[PDB]
Structure formats: structure tokens, C-alpha cells
Design an enzyme around this catalytic site. Structure first.
Site, mmCIF file in Angstrom:
data_model
loop_
_atom_site.group_PDB
_atom_site.id
_atom_site.type_symbol
_atom_site.label_atom_id
_atom_site.label_comp_id
_atom_site.label_asym_id
_atom_site.label_seq_id
_atom_site.Cartn_x
_atom_site.Cartn_y
_atom_site.Cartn_z
ATOM 1 N N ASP A 155 0.765 -1.073 -0.396
ATOM 2 C CA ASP A 155 0.098 0.063 -0.140
ATOM 3 C C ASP A 155 0.823 0.906 0.174
ATOM 4 O O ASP A 155 0.004 1.847 1.220
ATOM 5 C CB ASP A 155 -0.636 0.077 1.668
ATOM 6 C CG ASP A 155 -2.469 -1.299 1.010
ATOM 7 O OD1 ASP A 155 -2.027 -1.431 0.487
ATOM 8 O OD2 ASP A 155 -2.236 -1.176 1.735
ATOM 9 N N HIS A 158 3.732 5.118 -2.854
ATOM 10 C CA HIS A 158 3.570 4.555 -3.280
ATOM 11 C C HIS A 158 5.149 5.820 -3.549
ATOM 12 O O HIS A 158 5.043 5.796 -2.926
ATOM 13 C CB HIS A 158 2.466 5.663 -4.336
ATOM 14 C CG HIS A 158 1.718 6.988 -3.102
ATOM 15 N ND1 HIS A 158 2.676 7.538 -3.552
ATOM 16 C CD2 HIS A 158 1.257 6.801 -2.160
ATOM 17 C CE1 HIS A 158 1.921 8.637 -2.944
ATOM 18 N NE2 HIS A 158 1.169 8.003 -2.152
ATOM 19 N N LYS A 208 5.882 3.407 -13.455
ATOM 20 C CA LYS A 208 5.312 4.979 -13.068
ATOM 21 C C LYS A 208 4.361 4.776 -11.395
ATOM 22 O O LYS A 208 4.209 4.156 -11.712
ATOM 23 C CB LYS A 208 4.095 5.295 -14.185
ATOM 24 C CG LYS A 208 4.688 5.980 -15.523
ATOM 25 C CD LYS A 208 3.377 7.040 -15.875
ATOM 26 C CE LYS A 208 4.062 8.511 -15.043
ATOM 27 N NZ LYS A 208 2.794 9.536 -15.769
ATOM 28 N N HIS A 237 5.698 11.227 9.062
ATOM 29 C CA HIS A 237 6.002 11.895 6.601
ATOM 30 C C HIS A 237 5.768 13.099 6.964
ATOM 31 O O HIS A 237 6.087 14.209 5.775
ATOM 32 C CB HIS A 237 3.971 11.179 6.908
ATOM 33 C CG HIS A 237 4.147 11.634 5.499
ATOM 34 N ND1 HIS A 237 4.977 11.098 4.480
ATOM 35 C CD2 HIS A 237 3.570 11.749 4.339
ATOM 36 C CE1 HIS A 237 4.808 11.351 3.542
ATOM 37 N NE2 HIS A 237 4.154 11.831 3.375
ATOM 38 N N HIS A 295 8.266 15.992 4.898
ATOM 39 C CA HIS A 295 8.172 16.962 3.554
ATOM 40 C C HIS A 295 8.258 18.442 4.232
ATOM 41 O O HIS A 295 9.061 19.129 3.336
ATOM 42 C CB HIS A 295 6.050 16.643 4.352
ATOM 43 C CG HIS A 295 5.724 15.515 3.060
ATOM 44 N ND1 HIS A 295 5.712 15.603 1.150
ATOM 45 C CD2 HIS A 295 4.729 15.028 3.153
ATOM 46 C CE1 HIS A 295 5.065 14.702 1.217
ATOM 47 N NE2 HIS A 295 4.083 14.741 1.898
ATOM 48 N N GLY A 338 -5.918 16.838 -0.569
ATOM 49 C CA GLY A 338 -5.123 15.845 -1.676
ATOM 50 C C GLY A 338 -6.007 15.264 -1.915
ATOM 51 O O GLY A 338 -6.020 14.766 -3.174
ATOM 52 N N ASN A 389 1.277 21.818 -7.169
ATOM 53 C CA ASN A 389 -0.217 22.339 -7.442
ATOM 54 C C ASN A 389 0.530 24.008 -8.233
ATOM 55 O O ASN A 389 0.578 25.129 -6.960
ATOM 56 C CB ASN A 389 -1.501 22.388 -7.037
ATOM 57 C CG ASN A 389 -2.856 23.039 -8.169
ATOM 58 O OD1 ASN A 389 -2.694 23.875 -8.248
ATOM 59 N ND2 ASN A 389 -3.293 22.756 -8.133
ATOM 60 N N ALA A 425 11.099 17.846 -16.692
ATOM 61 C CA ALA A 425 12.103 17.822 -17.065
ATOM 62 C C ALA A 425 12.872 19.050 -16.661
ATOM 63 O O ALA A 425 11.888 19.926 -16.962
ATOM 64 C CB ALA A 425 11.832 17.589 -18.517
ATOM 65 N N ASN A 484 10.389 23.154 -23.473
ATOM 66 C CA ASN A 484 11.048 22.106 -22.443
ATOM 67 C C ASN A 484 9.878 20.955 -22.115
ATOM 68 O O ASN A 484 9.826 21.523 -20.887
ATOM 69 C CB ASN A 484 11.398 22.695 -21.374
ATOM 70 C CG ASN A 484 12.251 21.504 -20.479
ATOM 71 O OD1 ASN A 484 12.199 20.134 -21.113
ATOM 72 N ND2 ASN A 484 12.579 22.500 -18.853
HETATM 73 N N1 LIG Z 1 -1.383 19.741 -9.257
HETATM 74 C C1 LIG Z 1 -1.502 18.984 -8.312
HETATM 75 N N2 LIG Z 1 -2.656 19.974 -7.980
HETATM 76 C C2 LIG Z 1 -3.277 19.494 -6.935
HETATM 77 N N3 LIG Z 1 -2.860 18.443 -5.773
HETATM 78 C C3 LIG Z 1 -2.058 17.335 -6.370
HETATM 79 C C4 LIG Z 1 -1.373 18.032 -7.453
HETATM 80 N N4 LIG Z 1 -0.037 16.857 -7.404
HETATM 81 C C5 LIG Z 1 -0.826 15.844 -6.388
HETATM 82 N N5 LIG Z 1 -1.784 16.318 -6.176
HETATM 83 C C6 LIG Z 1 -1.908 15.501 -4.414
HETATM 84 O O1 LIG Z 1 -1.267 15.372 -3.645
HETATM 85 C C7 LIG Z 1 -1.562 13.821 -2.873
HETATM 86 C C8 LIG Z 1 -0.991 12.904 -2.156
HETATM 87 O O2 LIG Z 1 0.363 13.961 -1.830
HETATM 88 P P1 LIG Z 1 1.588 13.027 -1.508
HETATM 89 O O3 LIG Z 1 1.996 13.280 -0.752
HETATM 90 O O4 LIG Z 1 2.996 12.787 -2.353
HETATM 91 O O5 LIG Z 1 0.754 11.833 -1.408
HETATM 92 P P2 LIG Z 1 0.345 11.282 0.305
HETATM 93 O O6 LIG Z 1 -1.032 11.785 0.503
HETATM 94 O O7 LIG Z 1 0.299 10.147 0.110
HETATM 95 O O8 LIG Z 1 1.441 11.262 1.714
HETATM 96 C C9 LIG Z 1 -2.908 13.684 -4.122
HETATM 97 O O9 LIG Z 1 -4.065 13.044 -3.139
HETATM 98 C C10 LIG Z 1 -2.612 14.413 -4.888
HETATM 99 O O10 LIG Z 1 -4.092 15.268 -5.529
HETATM 100 FE FE LIG Z 2 2.687 12.947 1.174
#
Ligand SMILES: Nc1ncnc2c1ncn2[C@@H]1O[C@H](COP(=O)(O)OP(=O)(O)O)[C@@H](O)[C@H]1O
Ligand SMILES: [Fe+2]
Ligand SMILES: [K+]
Length: 566
Positions: free
Chosen positions: A12, A14, A39, A114, A118, A168, A314, A419, A528
Site C-alpha cells: 500500500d 507509492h 510509473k 511523514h 515533507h 489532496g 499545484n 524535465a 521544454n
Molecule cells: N497538481 C496537483 N494539484 C493538486 N493536488 C495534487 C497535484 N499533484 C498531486 N496532488 C495531490 O497530492 C496527493 C498525494 O500527495 P503525496 O504527499 O505525494 O502522498 P500522500 O498524500 O499519500 O502522503 C494526491 O492526493 C494528489 O491529489
Molecule cells: Fe505526503
């Protein structure tokens, strides 16, 4: 100190990645997916990425002072799974399998919360001594938002928002609902630009000066049959959206396509149909986040804002934060998402051990690179003809100025989804046909996807309204009037763009190529975009670059000192 930071676990999980800090410096840093070619690096320890980091630095695990993991994994097992079964030794055997990672003894193993991971990935690498911290993601162990104060090397938490209220998850769910898919929130952001917003509350959000409220869901709602609130939020948002939005969920279609010889996955509706929903979701996210940011800035009395967490990707939201009266300076690391918590965990632990953490310094080029011999080997495998130009940068410039598309694989692979001149597809910023060419002809994808420019830092002052560094393509800004029509393939109608500014120190070759380009078309600016085919991560090895070059109607490939043409 030498500290190896990790993210990714077999169940579970990513965005697996590994990061090696040596005396505060990034020795190596990469995402698992680049190696596996799958991916998002799902459901795996970052075996290959960590292998790369150690090889890169010429270390073994025995040379490590510490291994750091960017989640409090024991607490998640205790809380959500009825117990943490592993000794440190056993956890290490899972994170760093002995058949790949031989060791005399175990390094000290650290779990970092966590959101601290971050936050550390932003604060410690920003080059700023203090600021307000805003973490917005899907969900850490419990919380989905953290507001903290960063000062004197310390990150102090002020408040959190519980998982069920995740911004998110909200965004992913809408992305999934539109048929773009929860795994592609970035596309939803792209689509939002074409929509019109009616009611940014979506009949769910109530906004205030410190953030938001979600009336749709009990904030203390919790999944007893899982270890995050994804499913619970998914069901609430899907029922709600079907109730209030004119269109029901877009459905995924799986059918045999006799042209491809495969069952392929498609959507029942064109997701462009949901552009109004996208626009509305985007306005809601912005509004909620503006409040949160205002709130942490006032509470801490800072005017520097650090943002991380997945929502930190975002760029549209970030740019509007930037222009906000409450913000003077902003830093969002290229690795705002979970790929960044390996690096964050390493930093938090290295700092704990007395190390001073260096700024990232306008570059994300920490992945693998390859020597001319190694590139040549991969070229000789293919049997393809190639040249070794006396001045590659100049030839690439001329290719671009003429309206051709050039693959560009140089130096250490960049880390993160963007990139940045190490693994890029390059093209004219000045061409009013280049956008459709790359979207349709080249990448055979959606007409409505935007492209972005790379430009010399030394002209960005004249090109952009803001005289700041924009090293990562993680922040949108507006261009000045003298450029708002010169660069049609990388500039929107509202004059907004998502730029990379390039210094000569950060990337000499790329900087040189841009310089040459400027002498040809006036502005040292190009388009780019990511060097990948749909459904693969950014190419990493020279063989990857060749493979993708071969199946796309690109004109040239500049890989190492070599040029290959079609
Ligand atoms: N461009 C974006 N705009 C808004 N939300 C985003 C974007 N890219 C990623 N997210 C959000 O980030 C969330 C996951 O964030 P992450 O911190 O990588 O993992 P987790 O939330 O499992 O700790 C996703 O639910 C996704 O909606
Ligand atoms: Fe996270
Ligand atoms: K401002």
C-alpha cells in the site's frame, strides 16, 4: 554524517525513492520508477534507487551513519493493523534487501513523521533560515495538513487537519471522477484552465480566513478496514459530486483494439466535458489553501512560505500564493510530493546528528548520469548511425530555431515529475504550431495540455514580471508585455507561464544551448517538456532515451556528446 533516506514499502505505498546526504550535501537522489520503468513506484522498497545512491557515492550500507524512513511506519502498523511485527533488523531487510545490500551490521534505523519529512525537504534546502511551513498532501499517518514554524533549524508544529478533510484526496477523487484518473491530478490542473467556475464551495466547502471546513464529511471519519482515509473520502466525494454535478462519474472502458493488438483502457466520455468541474475543484483548492497559508504566516509572523506535500505540485495554486500580499518569499522543493520524504527524512536525521544542510541551489539534477563511453555502448547496440558534433549546443539550437523537436539527455537525471534540461524534449517557444505538433503529432495525447519554457536566468527579469529564481517549474507566473505574444507555445492567453530559469552554474551545457538559441531567434527561451512516452516515466538511461526516440516522430536526439537524427 552519511545518511540514507528512504521512501516506499511493499504494501500500500507509492512514490518510492532514495536520497543520500553526505555532510549536508545531496550526493545522489532518485525515484524508483526511473529504474523500474513503472510509473509512480508502487508497492516496493526503493531497492534500485538506493542501489544507485550507494554506487554513486562509492559507499556500502556499512558506511552509513543512519538509514531514515519518511513515515512513522511502526505507528501506522500499531494503529491501523494491530501491531508492528518487525525488529529494526527485519525492517532493514525489507527496505534494503541483503542480496542487493550486503552489510556486516545494521545501521541505526530512524522513522521520521511523514509531514516532518515533507517539511524538512522544504525548510532545510530552501536557503532560508526561517519561515512559515505549510504541508498539504493526501494524508500522512493521521493528518492531511500541517502548519508549522521553521526557525533556528527547528520545525515546530502549530496545528493539523485530520485525514478525512484531505484536500489532496478531494483533488484526486475529482480527477478520477472526470476520467483523468486519481493518479493524474496534474492533468486536472491543466484542464481547470479551460473551464469556468460557478460555485467554488461545490456545496461542500465553507471557507474562512484561516482555511476551510468540509461539511460533506465527519472530520474524525476513519476507515477501520484500511490505514488511510482514501476509500472513505472516495465514497463521500463520489456520492456528493454525482448529486450536484450535471455529469455522473466518467467510466473507464477496457476493449480490444485490433489496431494495437491489445485490450486498451479508455474513457466512456471525453474528460474535456468536465472542464467546469475541474475549474471549480481548482478554485476550491486555491481558496482553501490561501486561508491555510494566510493563517500560518500570521501565526508565525513570517513572510517566507515553505510548501510541500503532494498538493504542493499545484503550480497554478503556487503562483497565486506567490502574488499574495501576505507572502514575500516562497520555496517549494521540486520534490514536494512523497518522492521528497526520503530526502526529508534524511535531512531531519542529519540535522539531529549535527549536520548543516546545504541549499538545493537551483538544480534538481541528482539522478544517474552516463559517460560518453556508456552512451556510445548503448548506441552501438542499436546499430544506428550517429555523429559527434564539434559544437552540439549550437547544432541543437539551430535544430530548435528551425521548428524541429529535439530529445535532450544530458548529465545527471533530474528528480521529480518535471524535465529541467537533463531529460527533456525541446522545441520552439516562438512557434504558433509547436504546441499542437507536440501534443498531437509527437505525444499523441490531449490537445488541451499546456507546455512550459526554459529560459536563461539572466533574461528572466525582462521576460517575467517577477525577478526571482524559478528553477523547478513548480510555480506559475505572468510574463511581461514585451513577451506575452512572442512565445505562443509556452504562454497562455492570460499571459501566465510555468518557467524554468537556468543559471550557467546549474547546467552549463543547457545554458550554453539556450545562449546559442538566443542569437538565432532573439530570446534565449525554448519549449521544454518531459522526455517520455505516455505510460512510461521520464527516460533515465541512454537505452531508455533511444527506445523512446525510436517510437516518437522526434527529429533528433542529443544524448551525451552524440547526435542521432531521423
Ligand atoms: N497538481 C496537483 N494539484 C493538486 N493536488 C495534487 C497535484 N499533484 C498531486 N496532488 C495531490 O497530492 C496527493 C498525494 O500527495 P503525496 O504527499 O505525494 O502522498 P500522500 O498524500 O499519500 O502522503 C494526491 O492526493 C494528489 O491529489
Ligand atoms: Fe505526503
Ligand atoms: K507578493
Amino acid at each position: 554524517m552519511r545518511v540514507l533516506g528512504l521512501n516506499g514499502w511493499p504494501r500500500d505505498f507509492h512514490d518510492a525513492s532514495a536520497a543520500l546526504l553526505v555532510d549536508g550535501r545531496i550526493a545522489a537522489f532518485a525515484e524508483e520508477e526511473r529504474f523500474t520503468r513503472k510509473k509512480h513506484g508502487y508497492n516496493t522498497a526503493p531497492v534500485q534507487a538506493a542501489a544507485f545512491c550507494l554506487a554513486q557515492a562509492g559507499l556500502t550500507v556499512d558506511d552509513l551513519d543512519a538509514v531514515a524512513f519518511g513515515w512513522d511506519l511502526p505507528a501506522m502498523y500499531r494503529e491501523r493493523l494491530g501491531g508492528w511485527p518487525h525488529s529494526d533488523s527485519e525492517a532493514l531487510d525489507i527496505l534494503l534487501p541483503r542480496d542487493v545490500f550486503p552489510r556486516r551490521t545494521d545501521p541505526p534505523l530512524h522513522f521520521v513523521q511523514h509531514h516532518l519529512a515533507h517539511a524538512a525537504s522544504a525548510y532545510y534546502f530552501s536557503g532560508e533560515d526561517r519561515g512559515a511551513v505549510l504541508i498539504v498532501d493526501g494524508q500522512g499517518e493521521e493528518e492531511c495538513v500541517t502548519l508549522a514554524h521553521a526557525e533556528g533549524g527547528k520545525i515546530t508544529v502549530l496545528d493539523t487537519v485530520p485525514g478525512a478533510w484531505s484536500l489532496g484526496f478531494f483533488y484526486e477523487h475529482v480527477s478520477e471522477y472526470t476520467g483523468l484518473g486519481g493518479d493524474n491530478p496534474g492533468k486536472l490542473m491543466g484542464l481547470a484552465a479551460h473551464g469556468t467556475t460557478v460555485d467554488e464551495t461545490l456545496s461542500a466547502f465553507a471557507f474562512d480566513s484561516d482555511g476551510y471546513r468540509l461539511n460533506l464529511i465527519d472530520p474524525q471519519a476513519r476507515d477501520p478496514e484500511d490505514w488511510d482515509e482514501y476509500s472513505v473520502t472516495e465514497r463521500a466525494w463520489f456520492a456528493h459530486l454525482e448529486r450536484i454535478y450535471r455529469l455522473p462519474p466518467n467510466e473507464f472502458v477496457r476493449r480490444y483494439d485490433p489496431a494495437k493488438g491489445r485490450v486498451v483502457r479508455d474513457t466512456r466520455r471525453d474528460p474535456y466535458e468536465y472542464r467546469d468541474l475541474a475549474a471549480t475543484a481548482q478554485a476550491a483548492l486555491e481558496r482553501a489553501v490561501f486561508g491555510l497559508a494566510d493563517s500560518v504566516l500570521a501565526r508565525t509572523g513570517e513572510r517566507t512560505l515553505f510548501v510541500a506535500g503532494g498538493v504542493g505540485l499545484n503550480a497554478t495554486m503556487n503562483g497565486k500564493l506567490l502574488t499574495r500580499s501576505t507572502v514575500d518569499k516562497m520555496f517549494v522543493p521540486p520534490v514536494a510530493s512523497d518522492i521528497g520524504v526520503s530526502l526529508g527524512a534524511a535531512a531531519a536525521v542529519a540535522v539531529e546528528l549535527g549536520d548543516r544542510i546545504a541549499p538545493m541551489g537551483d538544480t534538481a539534477a541528482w539522478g544517474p548520469e552516463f559517460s560518453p563511453d556508456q552512451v556510445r555502448a548503448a548506441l552501438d547496440r542499436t546499430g544506428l548511425a550517429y555523429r559527434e558534433p564539434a559544437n552540439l549546443e549550437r547544432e541543437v539550437a539551430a535544430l530548435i530555431a528551425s521548428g524541429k523537436v529535439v530529445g535532450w539527455a544530458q548529465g545527471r537525471g533530474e528528480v521529480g515529475p518535471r524535465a529541467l534540461g537533463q531529460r527533456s524534449l525541446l522545441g520552439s517557444a516562438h512557434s504558433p504550431t509547436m504546441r499542437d505538433h507536440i501534443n498531437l503529432r509527437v505525444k499523441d495525447r490531449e490537445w488541451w495540455r499546456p507546455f512550459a519554457p526554459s529560459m536563461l536566468r539572466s533574461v528572466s527579469d525582462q521576460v517575467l514580471e517577477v525577478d526571482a529564481d524559478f528553477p523547478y517549474m513548480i510555480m506559475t507566473t505572468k510574463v511581461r508585455a514585451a513577451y506575452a505574444e512572442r512565445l505562443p507555445s509556452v504562454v497562455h492567453e492570460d499571459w501566465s507561464t510555468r518557467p524554468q530559469t537556468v543559471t550557467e552554474a546549474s547546467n552549463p551545457r543547457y545554458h550554453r544551448m539556450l545562449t546559442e538559441l538566443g542569437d538565432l531567434v532573439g530570446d534565449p527561451v525554448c519549449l521544454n517538456t518531459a522526455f517520455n512516452d505516455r505510460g512510461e516515466p521520464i527516460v533515465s538511461s541512454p537505452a531508455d532515451a533511444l527506445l523512446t526516440f525510436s517510437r516518437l516522430p522526434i527529429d533528433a536526439l542529443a544524448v551525451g556528446p552524440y547526435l542521432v537524427t531521423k
